[PDB]
Each structure stands twice: as structure tokens, then as C-alpha cells.
Design an enzyme around this catalytic site. Structure first.
Site, short mmCIF file in Angstrom:
data_model
loop_
_atom_site.label_atom_id
_atom_site.label_comp_id
_atom_site.label_asym_id
_atom_site.label_seq_id
_atom_site.Cartn_x
_atom_site.Cartn_y
_atom_site.Cartn_z
N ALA A 68 0.32 2.04 9.28
CA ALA A 68 1.47 1.50 8.70
C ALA A 68 2.56 2.54 8.32
O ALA A 68 2.26 3.41 7.75
CB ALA A 68 1.02 0.48 7.41
N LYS A 83 5.09 -2.51 9.07
CA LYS A 83 5.58 -1.62 7.60
C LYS A 83 5.36 -2.33 6.58
O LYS A 83 5.46 -3.49 6.14
CB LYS A 83 7.13 -1.46 7.82
CG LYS A 83 7.52 -0.93 6.60
CD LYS A 83 7.27 0.73 6.23
CE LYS A 83 7.43 1.18 4.99
NZ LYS A 83 7.09 2.92 4.67
N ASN A 89 6.23 13.12 3.53
CA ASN A 89 7.22 12.11 3.43
C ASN A 89 7.08 11.35 2.03
O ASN A 89 6.09 11.46 1.38
CB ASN A 89 6.81 11.14 4.30
CG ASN A 89 5.81 9.99 4.00
OD1 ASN A 89 6.21 8.93 3.13
ND2 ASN A 89 4.47 9.99 4.36
N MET A 147 9.15 8.41 1.62
CA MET A 147 10.18 7.29 2.33
C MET A 147 10.70 6.25 1.14
O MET A 147 11.82 6.12 1.34
CB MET A 147 9.35 6.73 3.31
CG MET A 147 8.81 7.46 4.60
SD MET A 147 9.84 8.16 5.36
CE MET A 147 11.10 6.97 6.27
N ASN A 190 -1.98 -2.56 1.02
CA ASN A 190 -1.68 -1.32 0.60
C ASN A 190 -2.03 -0.84 -0.91
O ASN A 190 -0.97 -1.16 -1.64
CB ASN A 190 -0.41 -0.60 1.30
CG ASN A 190 -0.12 0.75 0.76
OD1 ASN A 190 -1.06 1.51 0.33
ND2 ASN A 190 0.99 0.98 1.30
N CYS A 249 0.28 1.33 -3.65
CA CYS A 249 1.27 0.79 -4.36
C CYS A 249 1.46 1.40 -5.79
O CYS A 249 0.38 1.74 -6.31
CB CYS A 249 1.31 -0.97 -4.46
SG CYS A 249 -0.15 -1.54 -4.95
N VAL A 259 -7.47 6.88 5.97
CA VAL A 259 -6.87 6.94 4.59
C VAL A 259 -5.43 6.89 4.72
O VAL A 259 -4.57 7.21 5.73
CB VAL A 259 -7.08 8.33 3.96
CG1 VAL A 259 -8.57 8.53 3.64
CG2 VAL A 259 -6.93 9.59 4.70
N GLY A 306 -1.32 14.33 9.09
CA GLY A 306 -1.48 15.11 10.47
C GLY A 306 -2.69 16.02 10.20
O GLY A 306 -3.51 15.74 9.77
N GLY A 324 -0.43 7.77 12.74
CA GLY A 324 0.75 8.17 12.14
C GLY A 324 1.50 9.20 12.82
O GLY A 324 2.21 8.96 13.56
N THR A 325 1.38 10.41 11.83
CA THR A 325 2.19 11.51 12.45
C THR A 325 2.28 11.53 13.87
O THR A 325 3.42 11.90 14.44
CB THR A 325 1.76 12.74 11.77
OG1 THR A 325 1.71 12.64 10.04
CG2 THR A 325 2.43 13.93 11.92
C1 LIG Z 1 6.92 7.88 7.78
C2 LIG Z 1 5.66 7.42 7.29
C3 LIG Z 1 5.67 6.28 6.47
C4 LIG Z 1 4.40 5.65 5.98
N1 LIG Z 1 4.62 4.17 5.32
C5 LIG Z 1 3.42 3.88 4.92
C6 LIG Z 1 3.46 2.34 4.65
O1 LIG Z 1 4.47 1.93 4.65
N2 LIG Z 1 2.16 2.03 4.58
C7 LIG Z 1 0.93 2.39 4.35
O2 LIG Z 1 -0.13 1.95 4.40
N3 LIG Z 1 1.09 3.99 4.77
C8 LIG Z 1 2.13 4.62 5.17
N4 LIG Z 1 2.09 5.68 5.62
C9 LIG Z 1 0.74 6.47 5.57
C10 LIG Z 1 0.25 6.24 7.15
O3 LIG Z 1 -0.09 5.19 7.36
C11 LIG Z 1 -0.91 7.27 7.27
O4 LIG Z 1 -2.04 6.75 6.44
C12 LIG Z 1 -0.84 8.48 6.96
O5 LIG Z 1 0.26 9.26 7.62
C13 LIG Z 1 -2.08 9.50 7.59
O6 LIG Z 1 -2.31 9.32 8.86
P1 LIG Z 1 -1.75 10.43 10.04
O7 LIG Z 1 -2.38 11.81 9.63
O8 LIG Z 1 -1.94 10.02 11.53
O9 LIG Z 1 -0.21 10.65 9.71
C14 LIG Z 1 3.23 6.29 6.31
C15 LIG Z 1 3.32 7.68 6.75
C16 LIG Z 1 4.57 8.23 7.40
C17 LIG Z 1 4.46 9.47 8.14
O1 LIG Z 2 6.93 4.32 2.11
C1 LIG Z 2 6.54 5.59 1.65
O2 LIG Z 2 6.82 6.50 0.89
C2 LIG Z 2 5.07 5.44 1.89
N1 LIG Z 2 4.47 6.70 2.48
C3 LIG Z 2 3.17 6.91 2.70
O3 LIG Z 2 2.92 8.00 3.42
N2 LIG Z 2 2.18 5.91 2.32
C4 LIG Z 2 2.48 4.87 1.67
O4 LIG Z 2 1.90 3.94 1.43
C5 LIG Z 2 3.80 4.65 1.48
C6 LIG Z 2 4.50 3.49 0.72
C7 LIG Z 2 4.13 3.68 -0.92
C8 LIG Z 2 4.70 2.77 -1.68
C9 LIG Z 2 4.36 1.24 -1.77
C10 LIG Z 2 5.11 0.50 -2.56
C11 LIG Z 2 6.33 0.88 -3.21
C12 LIG Z 2 6.88 2.19 -2.94
C13 LIG Z 2 5.83 2.98 -2.16
C14 LIG Z 2 6.62 4.54 -2.25
O5 LIG Z 2 5.84 5.29 -3.24
#
Ligand SMILES: Cc1cc2nc3c(=O)[nH]c(=O)nc-3n(C[C@H](O)[C@H](O)[C@H](O)COP(=O)(O)O)c2cc1C
Ligand SMILES: O=C(O)c1[nH]c(=O)[nH]c(=O)c1CCc1ccccc1CO
Ligand SMILES: Cc1cc2nc3c(=O)[nH]c(=O)nc-3n(C[C@H](O)[C@H](O)[C@H](O)COP(=O)(O)O)c2cc1C
Ligand SMILES: O=C(O)c1[nH]c(=O)[nH]c(=O)c1CCc1ccccc1CO
Lengths: 313, 313
Positions: free
Chosen positions: A20, A44, A68, A70, A128, A131, A194, A223, A272-273
Site C-alpha cells: 500500500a 493507497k 518517506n 508522504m 491501516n 493511522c 510490516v 527496503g 514497496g520500495t
Molecule cells: C511512498 C510510500 C508510501 C506508503 N504509503 C503507505 C500507505 O498508504 N499505506 C500503508 O499501509 N503503507 C504505506 N507505506 C508502507 C509500505 O506499504 C510498506 O509497508 C513499507 O514501505 C515496507 O515495505 P518495503 O520494504 O517493500 O518498502 C508506504 C511506503 C512508501 C515507501
Molecule cells: O502516507 C504516509 O506517510 C505513510 N507512509 C508509510 O510508510 N506508511 C503509512 O502507513 C503512511 C500513511 C500513515 C498515515 C495514515 C493516516 C494519516 C496520515 C498518515 C501519515 O502519517
């Protein structure tokens, strides 16, 4: 030899999917993920209202992984619900919808409206639990009382099997408590371990500067940095939640890394990464690589080795 | 051009030292660390009585770092106190002694004995708060009320400036709470960030096995995996504890990695995994590499850039 899985009343050609947040924010992204060789896709994590997210730069990647902050940029729930209800081609692969409201009521309102679409079309909910809580309190999955409240209210509101996305834990007492909370909820059918490893800090030595703008440079890590953390969490929840599935996420760059996740207990494997860096071509590579390891070892199916990590004496 | 500095009423030839636990268990080890080019040394965290620790294999290293579940093997407090009182050559460098008792009472007992030797010889106490807690609770530094109790009892029993070794935290609320606890104790004059990243899991793909025997393969992570985590914790405590020193530990393999720790706020820089892998020769390499980066940049002193990491507007 095959990568097929049948779980949660769905068929998956292979265990791979996006994590995600990566390649899943817009209709264009979801169509891309659909066209890929992945076995599934997740949208997302959304709020009820659209969000612009935090100021840029807010994501950076490096040889060992990414950071990140974001700020949850997303098109809002109505968009992702419409994608699930009207746009997604379920003949190609299953769809997960991830939600991350800012309060329990926001999440409850989303899942009330997702339920009929889940029942009719088969979209799968991923909640998620990173939050944010009340600000100045830890994220929801680091506040076990909050986590329990969220799960009770979402379970009542939604009434259908769903899954949860968890941050990593680092203490055996926390694994124990977290899993005990999850095991209170029979509708929680999968656990994704995770999310990013929270609030790391990357600094560039040339510029003497942090690399992302929000939060004074602090952000979640993904990553290569996080693979052993990820595996630990996968296996810890695999051992503790025998009536649930575990999905693995973290540090997957190769079919070998996938194979380790699966040995640890993973059913689906999220990327993800490495997907952010390589693009969707990565799925054909990961499939080939994992089939090659299976062939060398004589394994014909994923169940032959899932959760079968060996311990020493 | 030299890296010599003054902290805690002692003079240091350079900011480098071993991380507690690495090359510091035996008299041989401690004499080896004293003979090296490090600026200081720390002894293995001790208990009142000797411990054998866990079964082997209990440490393993890889290209990106290490995993360990040593189980606190140590020669017992009496040994380390004798070393501080009778054996260490203080003309060569300062000595830190690490303690990690299994209860508050054990820690108090040790510190009451150490205090006279600290007054006489100037040995410095590092209290390891990643020590076990009462049943069902996480490590002491993850239980903020336990941490407060420990610090109140040790401060009263010891009565002299000391420091604390902290595990990493991953949530900004937790940074806020922890630093607030430490700031209640004026005798806490340095904070060492960080201990290993707890309970990761390394799996070998060929053998399909975990790589260490204790705890079904789970152990603390060090090395390249943990550098952004380490820097985050250093900077978070640097910002929150303006009247204390922060010592950096985690992921140091090069003078560039040291430089990053100092930019984040570190006064001393500790080396664990890389020292275990490369041996004591690493100190001359680290010093030369740090001086080289300083010369390239035009920095003459550590103080010119300590804590001066830049943020983006
Ligand atoms: C740019 C970015 C945005 C992400 N946004 C979310 C998100 O919207 N919801 C969520 O559950 N995790 C989010 N994550 C976390 C990833 O789903 C993932 O759990 C984390 O990057 C670890 O996996 P990886 O080592 O393959 O990157 C985000 C990660 C990245 C890098
Ligand atoms: O969009 C994010 O920063 C993000 N990045 C991650 O690595 N994992 C995540 O789960 C998130 C979203 C976390 C989140 C959920 C609801 C509102 C705000 C945010 C950003 O902290
Ligand atoms: C084999 C081994 C033993 C350790 N034992 C201790 C200990 O006794 N006390 C302690 O404070 N930290 C101990 N640690 C943690 C290290 O001091 C250090 O915080 C951690 O390894 C992170 O630094 P690194 O990335 O340089 O390895 C130990 C680490 C290793 C690898
Ligand atoms: O010796 C250890 O396993 C060790 N490894 C680390 O990476 N950091 C540490 O702090 C320790 C010692 C932790 C400890 C303290 C007090 C009693 C028992 C133990 C071991 O679990």
C-alpha cells in the site's frame, strides 16, 4: 511447479502484490498494477476526504532502502470505492482496498459504505493501523487500547472478513500483546507485517542535510534496512495467530527475499520500495526467481515450505 | 590537526570507543581496547554474579550487519570493578563501566559499590536500560514508569554523574516521553543512542534455518541495517536534552558514518558490529577518514558541526 494460492475465497496466480502506498494512488496507477504480472493489488490507504499530503521532497531512495513522510496523499474514499465498484477488472486479479482514517468514526463510516461493494464484487479490506491517533499519542497500533477500540468498531460496522496492516514491533512483550488483541477479533482474517520502520533519519554527508522536508527529516524506512525486522514480525504473528493468514511486507527485492518471507509464514508477499524503484517489471523477475529457488530445492507448491523455517536445536 | 576533546571532566584523544558488549568482556579484551587508538573504552554490561549467557551460536554477522542474543555473558561485577579500581591505566584513556542488573535492587547494589571507585579513579557509569523487567512488561526503557523508578533509585544510590544506554524508539510521542523522563534526572549527563534494534530475525535461504540458536532465531540487530534509526534517535535526544550529552551508536563503519552521527548531535561515537568484524585496527581508519572529511570541508573542530544537521525550510 506453481505459485498459485487460494485464500480468503479468492484465487491468486502468485503471491506478489504492491505494498500500500506504492503505485496505487490514481486510476492510472491501479490500471498499471492490474496490467502487471502481480497476483493482486492494493489501493493507497485513504481518508474520507482527498489529501494533498506533505510538502516535497517527501520520499527518497538509496541503495539500502527508502525514507518517506508522504502525509497520506490520496484521492479520497469515494474515488477508491468507485474504482472497486465500477472500474476494476476482477477477471485479472483480486483487489484490496486500504483505509486509514484519522479517527475511529472516519474508519467506521468508510467501512459501512465499503461493505456492500465487498459483498457484491469481492474487494478485500486492509485496515491501516499506523493511522495517527490523537496527536501526541503513538500511532494506533502502538496504543493497544486504541487498537482494540478501532477493531471492535470496525468489526461491528463492517461485518465481513478483513485484514490489518501492522507496524513493526521490537519487544517480545509487544508481539504477545499485539497478537492477543488481534486474536480477540475473528473477522480479522489476515495480518500484514510490516509497515515502515518509524521515524528513521537519513542525512546526506555532502550537503550536511536531511533528505526529506517534513518532520525535520524524520520518516518511515523501507527496503533492505528492514528485511530482518519484517521477517521477525511475520514469523512472530504466524506463530501467535494460528487462525489467521499473515502477509509479508518489507525488504523484498528478489525471489530469495520472498522465499524467506514465505518460510517465515507469509501467504501474500508485498513489494514497496523495490517496486517504487524498479517499476512493475519487477513482478516477472520475482516470479522467475522464486520458481528457480523452488526448482532447485524440489518444491512444487508454496504450501510445501510456508512457515517451515527451521530453528536450531 | 587532531580530534582531541573534553567531556564529563575527562580528556579524550578522539570521539571513538567500542560499543558495550564488543571487545570488552575479559581482561584480555579490555587490555586490547586500551592498547588501541580509541579515545575511550566501555566494559561489557554486567550483573552482580557471572553469567554464561545463552547457547551458541548466539551472534552472527552479514554484509549488512549483525544479529545477537548473547544473554549477557559476563565475568560479574566484581571483576569489572576490580578492573576499574586496580587494572585500568587511566593515563591511556577514560573508562566507562556498563551495568545491567536484572532488577532495580541489583542495579542499586552495584552502583553503591561503584560510587567510591568513580570518586577515586574517575571511571564513568553507563547504565544499560535494555534490561529485563517484571513479568508481562517490555524491557525497562520501553516501560516509562519502570525507567523513572530505575533512574530515581540509581540517582539516589550513586549520587554522581552517569549515563544511560537506550534502545531505539520509532514514534515521536515516545521520543517526547522518554526524553522527558531523562530530563527529570540531573545526574544523567549523557545518553547513548542506540542499543540494538530488538528482535529481528535472520533466515538463511540455503538451509532454510534461522542463524542463531536462542529465542528461535530472534535477536537484536546492529550494523548497516540500523544507521538511519540510530541517527534519528541521536538527533531526537540531542534536540530534547539540551543540558545533556548524546553519544551515538549504531551503523558506524566509516568516518563518514561517524560524521553523520556528529552532525546529528553525537559527542562520542561508539562502534559495535564493525569493530566485532574488523577488529581494533578500525579506530585508526575511522580517525583518518573523519579527519579527511573535516579537511575537505574546512572544519577544524568537532564543535563546528556537532548537531548542525540542516533541515529543509
Ligand atoms: C511512498 C510510500 C508510501 C506508503 N504509503 C503507505 C500507505 O498508504 N499505506 C500503508 O499501509 N503503507 C504505506 N507505506 C508502507 C509500505 O506499504 C510498506 O509497508 C513499507 O514501505 C515496507 O515495505 P518495503 O520494504 O517493500 O518498502 C508506504 C511506503 C512508501 C515507501
Ligand atoms: O502516507 C504516509 O506517510 C505513510 N507512509 C508509510 O510508510 N506508511 C503509512 O502507513 C503512511 C500513511 C500513515 C498515515 C495514515 C493516516 C494519516 C496520515 C498518515 C501519515 O502519517
Ligand atoms: C555481540 C554484542 C553484544 C552486545 N552486548 C551489549 C551489552 O552488553 N551492553 C549494551 O549496552 N549493548 C550491547 N550490545 C549492543 C551494542 O552496544 C550496540 O548498541 C549495537 O550493536 C548497535 O551498534 P552497531 O550498529 O555498531 O553494532 C551488544 C552488541 C553485540 C553485537
Ligand atoms: O548480551 C546481550 O544479549 C545483549 N545484546 C545487545 O545487543 N544489547 C544488550 O543490551 C544486551 C544485554 C541485554 C540484557 C541485559 C540484562 C540482562 C540480560 C540481557 C540479555 O537479554
Amino acid at each position: 511447479m506453481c505459485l498459485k494460492l487460494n485464500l480468503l475465497d479468492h484465487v491468486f496466480a502468485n503471491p506478489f502484490m504492491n505494498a500500500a502506498g506504492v503505485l496505487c494512488s490514481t486510476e492510472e496507477d491501479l490500471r498499471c498494477m492490474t496490467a502487471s504480472s502481480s497476483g493482486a493489488l492494493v489501493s493507497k490507504s485513504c481518508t474520507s476526504a482527498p489529501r494533498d499530503g506533505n510538502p516535497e521532497p517527501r520520499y527518497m531512495a538509496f541503495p539500502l532502502g527508502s525514507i518517506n513522510s508522504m502525509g497520506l496523499p490520496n484521492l479520497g474514499f469515494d474515488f477508491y470505492l468507485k474504482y472497486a465498484s465500477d472500474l476494476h477488472d476482477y477477471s485479472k486479479k483480486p483487489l484490496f482496498l486500504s483505509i486509514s482514517g484519522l479517527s475511529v468514526e472516519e474508519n467506521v463510516a468508510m467501512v459501512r459504505r465499503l461493505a456492500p461493494v465487498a459483498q457484491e464484487k469481492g474487494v478485500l479490506l486492509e485496515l491501516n493501523l499506523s493511522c495517527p491517533n490523537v496527536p501526541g499519542k503513538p500511532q494506533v497500533a502502538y496504543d493497544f487500547e486504541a487498537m482494540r477500540t478501532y477493531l471492535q468498531q470496525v468489526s461491528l460496522a463492517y461485518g465481513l472478513p478483513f485484514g490489518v496492516k501492522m507496524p513493526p514491533y521490537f519487544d517480545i512483550a509487544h508481539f504477545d500483546t499485539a497478537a492477543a488483541v488481534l486474536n480477540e477479533f475473528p473477522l480479522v482474517k489476515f495480518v500484514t507485517c510490516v509497515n515502515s520502520v518509524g521515524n528513521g533519519l537519513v542525512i546526506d554527508a555532502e550537503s550536511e542535510s536531511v533528505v526529506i522536508k517534513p518532520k525535520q527529516g524524520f520518516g518511515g524506512l523501507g527496503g533492505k534496512y528492514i528485511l530482518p525486522t519484517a521477517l521477525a514480525n511475520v514469523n512472530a504473528f504466524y506463530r501467535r495467530c494460528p487462525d489467521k493468514l499473515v502477509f509479508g511486507c518489507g525488504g523484498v527485492y528478489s525471489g530469495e527475499d520472498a522465499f524467506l518471507h514465505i518460510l517465515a509464514g507469509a501467504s501474500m508477499v508485498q513489494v514497496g520500495t523495490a517496486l517504487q524503484e524498479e517499476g512493475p517489471g519487477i513482478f516477472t523477475r520475482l516470479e522467475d526467481e522464486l520458481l528457480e529457488i523452488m526448482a532447485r530445492k524440489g518444491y512444487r507448491t508454496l504450501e510445501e515450505f510456508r512457515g517451515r523455517v527451521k530453528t536450531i536445536e
